[PDB]
Symmetry: D2
Subunit: 453 residues, 4 copies
Amino acid sequence: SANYRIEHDTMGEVRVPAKALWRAQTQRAVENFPISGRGLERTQIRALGLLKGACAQVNSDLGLLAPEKADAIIAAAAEIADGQHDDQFPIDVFQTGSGTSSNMNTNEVIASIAAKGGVTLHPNDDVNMSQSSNDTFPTATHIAATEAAVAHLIPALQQLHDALAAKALDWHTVVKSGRTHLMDAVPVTLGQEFSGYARQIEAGIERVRACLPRLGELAIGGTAVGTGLNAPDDFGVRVVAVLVAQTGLSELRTAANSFEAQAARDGLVEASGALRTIAVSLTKIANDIRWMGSGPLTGLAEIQLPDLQPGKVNPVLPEAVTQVAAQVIGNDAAIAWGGANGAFELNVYIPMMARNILESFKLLTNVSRLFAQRCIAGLTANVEHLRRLAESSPSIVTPLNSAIGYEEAAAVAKQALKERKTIRQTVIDRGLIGDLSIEDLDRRLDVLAMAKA
Amino acid sequence: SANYRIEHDTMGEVRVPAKALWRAQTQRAVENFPISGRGLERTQIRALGLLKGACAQVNSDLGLLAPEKADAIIAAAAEIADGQHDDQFPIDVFQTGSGTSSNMNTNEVIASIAAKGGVTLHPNDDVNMSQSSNDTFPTATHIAATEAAVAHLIPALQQLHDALAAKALDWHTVVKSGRTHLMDAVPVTLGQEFSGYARQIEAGIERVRACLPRLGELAIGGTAVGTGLNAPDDFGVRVVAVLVAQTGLSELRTAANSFEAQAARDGLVEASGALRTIAVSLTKIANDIRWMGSGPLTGLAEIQLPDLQPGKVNPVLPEAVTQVAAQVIGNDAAIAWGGANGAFELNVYIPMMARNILESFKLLTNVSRLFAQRCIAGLTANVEHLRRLAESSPSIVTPLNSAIGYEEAAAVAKQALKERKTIRQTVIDRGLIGDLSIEDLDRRLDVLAMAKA
Amino acid sequence: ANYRIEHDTMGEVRVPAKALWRAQTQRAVENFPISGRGLERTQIRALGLLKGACAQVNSDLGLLAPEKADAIIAAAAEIADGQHDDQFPIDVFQTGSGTSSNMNTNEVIASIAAKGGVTLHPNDDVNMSQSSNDTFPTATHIAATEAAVAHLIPALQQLHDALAAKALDWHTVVKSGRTHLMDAVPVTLGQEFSGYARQIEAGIERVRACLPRLGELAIGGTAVGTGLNAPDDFGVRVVAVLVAQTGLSELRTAANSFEAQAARDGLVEASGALRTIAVSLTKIANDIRWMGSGPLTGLAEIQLPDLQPGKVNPVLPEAVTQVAAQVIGNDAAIAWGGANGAFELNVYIPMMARNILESFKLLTNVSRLFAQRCIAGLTANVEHLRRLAESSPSIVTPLNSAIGYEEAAAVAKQALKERKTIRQTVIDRGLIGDLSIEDLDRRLDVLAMAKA
Amino acid sequence: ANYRIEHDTMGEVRVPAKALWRAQTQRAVENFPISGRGLERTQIRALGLLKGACAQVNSDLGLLAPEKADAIIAAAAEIADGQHDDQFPIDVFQTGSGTSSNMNTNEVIASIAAKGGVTLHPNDDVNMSQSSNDTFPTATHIAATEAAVAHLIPALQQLHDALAAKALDWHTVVKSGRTHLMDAVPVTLGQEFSGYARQIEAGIERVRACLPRLGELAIGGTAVGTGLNAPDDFGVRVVAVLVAQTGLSELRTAANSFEAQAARDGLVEASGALRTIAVSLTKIANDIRWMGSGPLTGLAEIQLPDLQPGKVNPVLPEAVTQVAAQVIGNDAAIAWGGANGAFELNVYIPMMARNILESFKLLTNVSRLFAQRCIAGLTANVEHLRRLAESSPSIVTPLNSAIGYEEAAAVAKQALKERKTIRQTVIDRGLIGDLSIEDLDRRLDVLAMAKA
């Protein structure tokens, strides 16, 4: 069987692939949890890298760890954090609830990498010095989630907002009939509707920023149960300082309360709530847009979606956005479930929670840029059609009530539909105008003024 | 005979109950939606009252409505807002999506009340002047939700926080074994665990405050599609100014964007997210507490819950808290579903969304006070028992690894565990003391210092 | 009479004068002021049925004096007949086992028996052979089973019939199909409605598929499931009486008496079926409000009847989808409580009961409303529908075998620009003669393309 | 070469040299860089089965040349045999109908046939008689049905057997029951496990109950469900071939071809069953980790094995409950998508497929693991459990009729203060005699109280 170096944990024998930098513990964990076949996300591996490096830096600063060992860890951690080893983390997402396995995985890989550079490290004694698994994995998760929100999800939303706001301006005077309960209503502009979508996204950004104060709080330094036992007293504070300086994420901070920070994962539940709300907003926007398109003769035909690769263009991007929204809502239900079921000094749903929140960040980041660039940007409005429908709608007969009778007017509406003409063109055909000048029919039937832009 | 009145409209005879202040439209709506048998919540009726009164005030200020009619509306609306007519709103929660029926219900009742005071009002022309149903009902909902959050839920949480923080102080030095994965771990204090619960509640308060900027935004002044057609151009701003002054809720404000504010209900979805996160925290707290009191001989027996009737007490209040949390999570799923399915200028899930968010506010407010006063406040700790378990735990023979041989320390842990005595006393039964002095012992086996209180 | 005093032997209590409940209930009222909502009528009725059956069986086994049994039986019967829905004030959010509501039922039965000159001990007589832990869950499954068999299924059947009738009336009403919301090949309005009809029929099938477990009862377990302090066949006798009295053949003792108290999986399972029906109804109600949707700027395929009997709001479809949203949320609360039992007792029963019974009720009622006041009165805009189908680019492909892909594509471009039928566009380009007109009509037959 | 340049109708693209997919797939790869996760293996296999069956039938009806049919069949067979799981790069989040993945399958079959010297038109030949709208949903229900019958059910059966075995081995292992988490009357560990066992058995029954609808297939319905441009009996023939090749008698044509494409209710229904099983497992895994829970400060009723040959972390219970959480979330996403189809097509299929198939997989795998590496190796602390049962105040009431209530209460209080057994504390208060030690050891028989 293919190249399989042998290794000995006190328990016994074990065969790891030859190109593998992980070691026995990881290989066991691989045999123990063949459940989903999916391992850690890249963003998560990077965060473990950042964290291990910072810890070695601080351990060295406090003179607890020899500088040679520290430097080898730091350089190893840096490759991992730079995404050079995403293929060295084979452990299933569904593992020990504290994330111990993945933590040991990181330690083993760092020692293997340091060894190929002629330095010997003890996975636990050196790489895991001053740390518990119980404070390490949750800290990596909140680092990944915080980076995903600040460096990815927010800029992506900002780009979607800009693209919607641009349409709100270009279409400022594109008048159309409003719809409520799906029925004809008074006039709006396409530009007003898009400023509505634009605000929704802007509010999404505000709600993501509102959760950062708690999403960026870190458990590091709390160790086994939160008492910091066997860590130097200011380990957390120092580690976070190093992480902020290296990543530029001012949002990371030690936890207000070190017990709440390990016994619970409320910050992830809170952030998931914001992601879900954005999914709700996007569902609305994407649904309006595919309806506005929807195809040409038997639908609304208000706008034309660009083709993904340039006439009945399928609303492919709106289908992606709503599918993604559904996934975010599902993930969000799994996160709350795990959030609620901690016991005493440790919540043991972290690997499952991390997987769902990080996927939610990723999906929303990516579909938002796609939606902005390959759909919203290239939309075209059927200006004449929209305006002709607005000017032919019975909803706009009401000003006529001072100029003609309530029954005289309702008849205008009643024929305009029957004979299918504009209201103006109809008030001209029952002979009405004057005694109500033509010049003052135009005034009370000004659909753009009714939209009160 | 006596007690039913007969009423009429264009279709025929409605036949309402004699004491009813509602009229035909309301009675039809009653016949059209016999679905749940449950009508508007009190807090929602009050808000409709506040809103109608403020509208009449402003209509009068702008000289659009005769001061005599305005004053009769204002006084009628004030009785409604003061809860004197909660029995005059029979319409099912499941009705027209915009809340038109309940809006008409409010108008009819105000006109009936004004009439009994010798003033005639047209339900629509006077009471509904400058308003659409589409901006009125959602505005009432966000007024009710904002009041529930600021006047009731936050003070309730503050009370629950105080009671947990008090226990955190009283129990500062009550040392016990920590648990992770439900297994024995290093020492914590009961006080530390409670400071953790305390911070969860404090974070709950912070997350409710973080949503107010959007929960308090109001649609009033939009009318039918968000344009303000057939209303004074500054109606919204005036109405909100009156509501703020009357209620003292500085958090109320006109919407940033009047289209987003009617086409969507994202602020309710966002608020529900925070309520759900609080349900998640409470579930954890209530679970830890019922496990700690768990029944005396076959459970953990760490604390004793007070009886609701001032030796086995059922943890009744924790069962209420977790049942409530389950309901908040369900309600929050219905809110998101409705939030996502608006169309164009109007979201038509408002009555259903209002019912669920308002109930969620109410349940969390009430169970939080109950939990604080009738459970948390009266807890007692089994101090001796807790301390004896901590001093008998394998976890603590590691300070020994230096003063005695590893295979002797692990032996201390396995010797004590069997004879079931403290770890200090199994050092004595081996005689290790001397050659190991005493005070060095009580030094290394100091469980309270290990909790690092 | 403002308030009477009651004894607790652990304190004194003031209960309203017209109240048939006693001290324990009044305490429970002071201890759980949480939601302000008590037991549902269907749930009160079930507690009534159960207490009566228990007294009948206790008497049969000669454990309870026939005079006391008869007083309980008659009291229980008034409660089960809905005469005392106002005597159950205890909040839904209470002790997780439902002990409070169980005591409430006992107290009221004793008060009622007392007004007829018979003395009963709420616990010793009315609760004989029973625990709270097996009693409340049994009442819940009786209520849920009755709600499914006597109410929801008949309601669904009625909605099905009304959709099947439209499927027949509209068999030949041809229209353009839509996929991804874009024009597609022809369907009939009748075919779409047979599709809605089958969804409801499948809903009925999935409700019947859960009855074998929804109707399983815990009665006879007592406190932890062992049957301690009950006669070995108490459960079997009680269920036999309930089946005979109610006519619900679906009720049965539980396969395993421990699973039947330690868990509420039957409720979680039934909720799944209700939620699936909510999913189906959302689809149906959405298609229908879109098909309405208002007259000039929408699809205008059909006209909804007005409830106030040209612009009628889709009011009933808005009710159906709001209800569907509530069923989905209730279903999430039920699963949460279902999952969190511990050892011999699940303590989320009152919360689970409230949500599943409401879900039954809402779906029962909105289904009858939808059927009678919306589906039954719909009218189809037949000419309009057919003209749009005959004018669609999607029906030019059968022209391919007779003219090019290219002439077929120019025909499609021209019909849209000139707003004509495809058939008239073919005649206007002078393509007939050389394909004949009978061939053109064979090929452009939209009703045959739908496959009648 | 590094990048073969394939050409496309609207331009050109660079596909990896070792790629069997073609232009359309590569475009779809550039258009949906969303999740970075493609089709599941079980789903790729099902597309293979389906394409093969279709070619077989097209040939049977003499619509497709036997040489082309044979090359498709052999290509499809490699794909169905899992030899090309690396040729399906398209994101799960794509066109709602699954068109992209359907084209992906067609291109790969043509590339494979070409390497064997036969030319196939991806659309004209491999997609003959098929629409994307009936193909992808059919593949999904084939995958879900196979996952339920060949994998999940056998896994659950294994977990049931392992729990039933403990129910027998531990038949007389008496212990204190818990309700509310408080001491209660005696049960045996074997009774509790028969309860877990029945929950899993019920899980199996609820999966079987959904197969009649989970196994229904859309194939033959084409674009909108009318079957336009497919042979009248295409569906029926394709399903017959699939049943014969796979041995899955559960597969069947849909009852109504419109409902079968306009909706995905069968997936929503199946997800309901999977969710119920997640609820049951959460309960079972929770009881078990509490029964472990660690040795001195916990319950210490049983000892969990360590994973490979009393301080053992409950690692497998943590995996089960994490999985349960994921199934509950996936189940929420499935319902959301289920509800939001429009007219003749539900466009949430790729998302729904991904969630239901993962739910099957996770439950299958963690169920075997739980059974073999946890349940099988559990040991009960028999003496400890029995001593606690014999020392419980819950068991003094069978004494009420020899000593009274008050004495039975002093025995109970003193038993607790001095940590003695009840038996020993009755003797110590000199109650015996005039109560024989024989009357005493009959009334205090905890195993008889469990009524085992």
